[PDB]
Design a protein around this ligand. Structure first.
Ligand SMILES: [Zn+2]
Ligand SMILES: [Zn+2]
Lengths: 300, 134, 300, 134, 300, 300
């Protein structure tokens, strides 16, 4: 049985470097040669206690691309009892929940049934990091010795926190953090990079570092996080247009977990650097790889 | 004073009653002698040094003697455990641990002026000053 | 063709004793040897006019475990017209509805398409009774000469009304009713038991009869049904803790149709008597058996 | 044992710790000696028979001696008070007392097999078996 | 100063017999000779934390009929803090709240400002009882030696509980309770009547006692309280039509706290016995009397 | 006519020092000797486009305490047209609105009818600052040479921004700012204090400066503004308990614009330092003074 057979996938912090490469290798193999019957006769629960249409469609398409059946819901009884019941029905549970730690709690009541965390509040969203890693590896050919810029709401973007920690398991990466002072990268992340001797630097605009960047990871800057007028005075620092890419490396890719509002102008879409829609399409293979490794003994 | 059992001595003021409540030590049926202003005496019960270590966050400078046949057959002291379960409450109001039939659990990390306590569920880390305040 | 082929399943009162044993035998056979392709190329409508996530996930998992396709909805046009249209689409209709008699009405407009009642208001919920019967038969080895206690809201629990009437089709059963005077077992049920010479008795607490009980069937006591303070003064009579089971028979099982609030304390969950989650898992096989018998000519 | 103060003796099993928690008796700063399996000794603090009466619902058969100059200057016993404040919780979930900065308060009424406790706020009456259960 | 000057009006159980007669005498005097400037320069808060348009319009009309100004609202911060703030604004607080005991709690934070309970959950609604008493006294000439029938939901009708306890402070009254067994008069009320030697009896229909009745007090039988079908089988016992009044005493009055659905048919409205709308109009004078006594030192 | 007769009251920044003292002197005079008929025959519109029960009750009580009539609403057509219509009805407009600048816009369409800003989004709320100033002047005897500490969310608390700017019009005041780094006093306020040579300093906890403080102004720290866990790790820096006041000056007052959640523990309420409820009661006189000066030619 493969190292991830019947394992719960709760947090990126639980995934070793070998685990990461195993998922990424399986994702590449399933992309090259689909296996539409690998999970025939499996029934998977798609439990979206917190609705997320974009996440659910991606996960459920992944299940169907492997031949599994899907039951589920979007949106009293304790979560423990709900899992105690559903884990008697299905072969795996994919769940998104508004409370942090909900997926971890589910593992303590699901018995032999594996739990895949599709997002638990502001905690973890492992398959988003895995599809980001898979997209970086696919476009750059590696996950080491890269120049990665990350732009926007770094303070509350749990997506960049997870991607930073995952990329920190590979060598020679250099990071550029471009955020307003009120939404800066948290100190615990900077401490982690210092403990490992990983180079990082702060920059107030993307043009300072555009020439060296391999990956430009743009994030949602929700207007909630600041004043409506506080937004407008800083927002130019963190919005991307096509003219900003005049000196970009030929291999650079713009990434964005989506949805975008206006942090990426639509004239970026037609440049060869735009890769956020290809990134979204890669979620199918990263989530396929997770379901395949967890529910099938032998490797793909 | 006591025949066979366990003793906890040199508990800071306003902590002996806390140890009795938080660790449910008076939920036995054999003798217990307690003196405040604090010291606590129990007869005939195991105390693993896991459990003595659980006193470190509250009574760091204290001792525990395993007593059998009126004799001191040991003198262990608490030092910081790796994990602290059941007794602490996660200060994250959105943590799943609050409405659910699970035991609280925190990882322990010593710092300069602080203990860092990381919740098993929400994976958020807090100062021990924050966790013990509510 | 088996006796239930192409039959509507509307009310437990319509099910003969042979019908009950047929469903239960099929459920046991499908549990021992699954048939994941028995209903391939069938399309089943999951019509939840009244939403019930816990009921729907169980029913839809049953459909998928037999290989059927599922279309459906949760939550103007008459119900007759809706069935007149949907019955041109699908091979069977599973429906839950807020109005009593809705499933019976559907049979008069569905043509050759069978209707399975997943709950019609405060009337019938046949598959809940069938999974209860199947769980009792599985844990006790029989459905006759049992001591069955039923606790809580017996007045409005249509679930215990149906289970009592079903168990009354088997011999030598003895019943214990433990309910507050305001929520007592209705007289029409007691009359039915008297006409058949079936022994029953009232008890104000579970400890009176704990030593003789084979099945302890706990029910929801919704706070709606009484005052919030009327609740508190009687609720101890009808809540179960682990210490209450000190003199229970080794074979006794605690059942509960779920969800529980606090009628069953969580320290009961770890005792060998707790069987409400296993009971819920048995709904898959009872509902599989119904779909198999209704949609497949030959027996399993 | 003790110089001047108060003593509470013949407390039923599994009630001495309850009296310490519910009445916050260890929130003083002078000596306290406690023995379980229960008896409790405090030095230098008043106890009105209002407060001794508040022990009736928990330790009905018990005694309280006012001690001064190493001498027994009294021996009072608890009998049912008219009102019980602060310690009980109203079992009515819709009672205003639950989310608000007020002290709980119940009127006491003896019955055949029961104590009737009537909440000051919601004016609902409950058995003492119901109130002490949660 | 009159005995009720600056007093809180929280519960009927707090009102002595002299208090009751004082309110009723003041109500009669204000009805005979209005004093539209008695409370000029007073500002009264109409605090309906739980909305009740019918109660609020009556209370606010009472305030205006005495010349007071009105501020208020219909429908986080503790109730204690809200009262701590509002009691610095106004001269009196009239409040309706969904939680029992809310008015009592308000008195502990309102300082010198009196609180008038317009309804606190299922606890007290003193001005409804006071207008009922005032209407009985006005139509019958007294509150003693009366035959009072009370029909409908006696179990959950806190309005009849309060009226019974108030009438029990006067001598020689005889009560008839007509309710379904599931909604009978609670035992604590019957105990209270037994302790005082007050005669009462149960009757399954109004026609048994119609000939002796001085006051027929009809109540709301909400369909919530029973099944929709449980309702229909008992509801005839507790609905009043004009033909039911063929042998009624000339002085009998039909009362109802309102709203009625169909417990009183509209053909009763035109008989001289119908007095529920006159009863509602009397709420103006009972609530005027309370505000006058509480806010004005000298009697009317 | 007094200097504020028929003037709009939109922003504290529009109020000169003489204006501030005029309002405060009038408020003191109306408190000492009420004039309940000063505004008889005036009709004032209470326009709460954004609902605020606590603000509205205070404003409307002020109107009634002066004898004015009140029409209004709480919660398509342009705001300009609404004011164009309402200003033909009434003698003054008191308005609260979710958009910044709404009160200023109203003045350009209200003709001769004065507009009083009860809050326009995150911009201005002048009567809150005026009641704060009035409370400080009343308890301290002056508005100059005071030690003022301000605690909590200083970044988004527009209430402390306004109070700081108003107090900066008086001499010799010294400020202490106690806020988390993510919610610090904005730089434009600190610049303003530097231009005027006003002394200020930052402090991470209240105990550093407790001994010197004349006014302790506590603010709402809404959980929205940070993470739920970010809150918990900093919240102790900015919560007040009674034991914190052990070395406070005898004359110090704790202020809070309300509502409080738990930034001020209830054991502070009984100390002589607690003055937030008295502060709220002073809003009546500050708002009376504004209406009197705007609608009445001659001074009080
Ligand atoms: Zn947590
Ligand atoms: Zn209560």
């Amino acid at each position: 049985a493969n190292p991830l057979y019947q394992k719960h996938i709760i947090s990126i912090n639980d995934l070793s470097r070998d685990d990461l490469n195993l998922v990424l290798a399986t994702a590449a193999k399933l992309k090259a040669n689909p296996q539409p019957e690998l999970l025939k006769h499996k029934v998977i629960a798609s439990c979206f206690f917190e609705a997320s249409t974009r996440t659910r469609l991606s996960f459920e398409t992944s299940m169907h691309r492997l031949g599994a059946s899907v039951v589920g819901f979007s949106d009293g009884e304790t979560l423990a009892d709900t899992i105690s019941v559903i884990s008697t029905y299905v072969d795996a549970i994919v769940m998104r929940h508004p409370q942090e730690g909900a997926a971890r709690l589910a593992t303590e009541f699901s018995g032999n049934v594996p739990v895949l965390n599709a997002g638990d509040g502001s905690n973890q969203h492992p398959t988003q990091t895995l599809l980001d890693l898979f997209t970086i590896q696919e476009t750059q050919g590696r996950l080491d010795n890269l120049h990665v810029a990350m732009v926007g709401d770094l303070k509350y973007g749990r997506t960049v926190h997870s991607l930073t920690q995952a990329l920190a398991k590979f060598d020679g990466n250099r990071f550029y953090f471009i955020a307003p002072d009120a939404l800066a990268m948290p100190q615990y992340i900077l401490d982690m990079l210092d403990e490992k001797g990983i180079a990082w630097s702060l920059h107030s605009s993307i043009e300072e570092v555009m020439a060296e960047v391999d990956i430009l990871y743009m994030t949602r800057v929700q207007k909630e996080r600041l004043d409506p007028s506080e937004y407008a005075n800083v927002k130019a620092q963190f919005v991307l247009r096509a003219s900003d890419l005049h000196n970009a490396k030929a291999n650079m890719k713009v990434l964005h977990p989506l949805p975008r509002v206006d942090e990426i102008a639509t004239d970026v879409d037609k440049t060869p650097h735009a890769w956020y829609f290809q990134q979204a399409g890669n979620g199918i293979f990263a989530r396929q790889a997770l379901l395949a490794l967890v529910l099938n003994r032998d490797l793909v | 004073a006591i025949k066979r059992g366990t003793v906890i001595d040199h508990i800071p003021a306003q902590i002996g009653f806390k140890l009795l409540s938080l660790f449910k030590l008076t939920e036995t049926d054999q003798r217990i002698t307690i003196g405040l202003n604090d010291l606590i005496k129990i007869e005939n019960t195991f105390l693993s040094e896991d459990q003595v270590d659980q006193l470190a966050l509250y009574a760091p400078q204290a001792t525990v003697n395993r007593i059998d046949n009126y004799e001191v057959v040991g003198k262990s002291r608490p030092s910081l455990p790796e994990r602290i379960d059941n007794v602490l409450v996660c200060p994250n109001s959105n943590c799943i641990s609050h409405a659910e039939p699970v035991s609280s659990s925190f990882a322990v990390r010593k710092r300069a002026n602080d203990i860092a306590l990381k919740c098993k569920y929400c994976e958020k880390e807090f100062s021990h000053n924050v966790v013990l305040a509510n």
